[PDB]
Amino acid sequence: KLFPNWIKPSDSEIPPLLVYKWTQGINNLSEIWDVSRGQSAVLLETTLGEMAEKIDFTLLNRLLRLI
Amino acid sequence: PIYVKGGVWTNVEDQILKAAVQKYGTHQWSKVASLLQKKTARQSELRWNEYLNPKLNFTEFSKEEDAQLLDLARELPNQWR
Amino acid sequence: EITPEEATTIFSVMVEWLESRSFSPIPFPPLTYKNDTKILVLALEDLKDVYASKVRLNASEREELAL
Amino acid sequence: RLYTESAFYNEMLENTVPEIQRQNLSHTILMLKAMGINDLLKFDFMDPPPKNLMLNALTELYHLQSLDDEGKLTNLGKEMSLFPMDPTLSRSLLSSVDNQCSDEIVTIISMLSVQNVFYRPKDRQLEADSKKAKFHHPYGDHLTLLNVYTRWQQANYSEQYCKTNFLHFRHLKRARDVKSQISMIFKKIGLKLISCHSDPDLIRKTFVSGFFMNAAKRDSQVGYKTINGGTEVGIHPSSSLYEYVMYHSIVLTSREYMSQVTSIEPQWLLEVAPHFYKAGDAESQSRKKAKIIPLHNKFAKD
Amino acid sequence: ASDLSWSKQTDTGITHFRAGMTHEDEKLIPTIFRYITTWENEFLDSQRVWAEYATKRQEAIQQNRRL
RNA sequence: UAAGUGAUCUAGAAAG
């Protein structure tokens, strides 16, 4: 149980399936759609730009030596 | 018989490769490979890069150089290239 | 690019995380495994997946297949 | 006769065959050794058995420690010969006080000395299987035998209780009389009769102690592979398991099965029979030899 | 092909159908999209069938049989 | 106070 549930791609569920699940999760949040008491939702999509392309081996090495 | 390439660098073979390199230069590795019936292009190029090229050195390291090395190991962990 | 302070912080974070998890690290794989063979079979299968379709193969490809 | 007169006169063998050519000779060799017969090959049988059957049975008795390697009786082989029993069962039963479960093992042994007590009619399988499941110990057919006998002797018994639970009264009654006769021998020879408050590990260890050569391991290709001879075997239908088992019986039909099976920890196989589970005795490195090597290394030394 | 200038502002109900891949002597070639189970259906369906499987597994356990 | 009018691109020859 290294990688927690929240990491998507490897889950053993299909990308459309994943999407569907995400949607379900969003819906199933407790009183998420209320706009009465100034309730305000925000969804933040962003890309971790060059996430692999600037991993330093030193730091990476030490990190791995943890796991 | 046709087969998959590999094996070990016999001295004659090495010499031949060197000759080829003199002839065709360090970026036509296909031709040089072809010249050697046993060894591949990639293999050849690697060999040239690693062992055979004269602008490398295999002289032992001075104490200062040893220090530099081991210090590098300490600081850059096993990024040996 | 990484400031050493930043690196340190990162290390602290990750350490904290696994600390919270009781995450025992992955060992260097010995001769112990009942799965070892099974594991091997997966990797080979994956590799084979490249080569089952394309009948005409390169030299490198051929070598890989042989291996 | 649904055959020709010529087939009767010429093709049928005269006699089956005498019983000696249709047996394992494990008990017979131990008897001949206790009688003082050194040369078993030249014992004057009216019809001699195949020499290989005698040699295999000498080898088994050496593994059980009843004989030494020079083919002489040990203290254990002399004590074993005093019991009117198979050697594996007798040895399991004698040692059972050391493992604090002699009372339970005296029951299991008496049950193994009778036929299968569970009735399963062809057209009434589901009701019969459900009644057996009242007594069934998962991964533990030998413990299932203990549970049925204990219920059969319970105060909650009634006249037709065996019929209403699909149990053969004749076989359970025979197992009781065998248990009483066995218990009288335990008292006569000073065995100590003992039990534990709660322990299925000890019963399994005792059963291993006699039956360590009748072991099989779960494997992906064969279902199960026997420790002795490396035979591909299935579990016999009567049992569904939830990776090592001991079996009472090897059943040969059009396929090979093992019947009457109890799960065992394979560390206990190494502990209880280290001479037999010596990795040198295992040729090459097939699935069993391979799985024994992790158990010795990764699951025991470290 | 709805009203392109309006459609940019708000979603319209589809009003006008353009002819896509046409032909003379138009035999109504069926699409592929009709013969693939659309994802939502697949997922509700999945939930059903897996639930069923779960239930029967329990039945098997209770009955002590191979399902 | 409760239907179906209508918008219909192409398009073949050479040499490679």
A12 Cβ contact list (under 8 Å, min separation 6)? none
Asked if residue D281 lies in contact with residue D269, where contact means CB atoms within 8 angstroms, the answer is: no
E67 Cβ contact list (under 8 Å, min separation 6)? E56, E57, E59, E60
C9-14 contact pairs (CB < 8 A, 24+): C10/A59, C10/A63, C11/A59, C11/A62, C11/A63, C14/A63, C14/A66
Q: How many CB atoms lie within 10 A of CB D217?
A: 18
Q: Are strands D256-263 and D232-235 parallel, antiparallel or unpaired?
A: parallel
Q: How many CB atoms lie within 10 A of CB D58?
A: 19
**How far apart are alpha carbons B35 and B15 in whole angstroms?**
12
**Contact check, Cβ <8 Å, A66/C18:** yes
Q: How far is CA D250 from the centre of its chain?
A: 9
Nucleotide nearest to E26 (CA to C1'): F8
Closest CA to C50 of C62, C36, C37: C62
C10 Cβ contact list (under 8 Å, min separation 6)? A59, A63
Q: How many Cβ pairs closer than 8 A exist between chain A and C?
A: 22
Residue with tokens 């063998």: D13
D32 Cβ contact list (under 8 Å, min separation 6)? D40, D43
**C34/chain B closest Cα distance in angstroms:** 31
Q: How far is CA D15 from the centre of its chain?
A: 30
For residue D24, give the amino acid letter: N
Interface with B, mutate which of A56, A57, A62 (most B CBs under 10 A): A57
How many degrees, rounded to 5, is the angle at CA B22 between CA B19 and CA B24?
Answer: 105
Q: How many CB atoms lie within 10 A of CB D295?
A: 21
In chain D, residues preceding a discontinuity (C to N beyond 2.5 A) are 242
| DSSP characters over B14-80 | HHHHHHHHHHH-SS-HHHHHHHSSSS-HHHHHHHIIIII-TTS--PPPPHHHHHHHHHHHHHSTT--
Asked if residue D147 lies in contact with residue D107, where contact means CB atoms within 8 angstroms, the answer is: no
Tell me which DSSP letter residue C28 carries.
P
Tell me which DSSP letter residue C21 carries.
H
**How far apart are alpha carbons D60 and D67 in whole angstroms?**
9
C50 Cβ contact list (under 8 Å, min separation 6)? C61
**Contact check, Cβ <8 Å, B76/A62:** no
Tell me how long chain B is: 81
Instruction: For residue B71, give Cα distances in angstroms to A59, B20, B34, D228.
Output: 17, 39, 43, 58
| DSSP characters over chain D | --S-HHIIIIIS-SS---GGGGS--HHHHHHHHHTT-S-STT---SSPPPHHHHHHHHHHHHHHTSB-TTS-B-HHHHHHHTS-S-HHHHHHHHGGGTTT-HHHHHHHHHHHTS---B---TT-HHHHHHHHTTT--TTBHHHHHHHHHHHHTSTT--TTHHHHTTB-HHHHHHHHHHHHHHHHHHHHTTPPP---SS-HHHHHHHHHHHHTTSEEEEETTTEEEETTTT-EEEEPTT-----EEEEEEEEESSSEEEEEEEE--HHHHHHH-TTTS-GGGS-TT-HHHHHHHHHHIIIII-
Residue C32, exposed/middle/buried by CB under 10 A (0-12, 13-18, 19+)?
middle
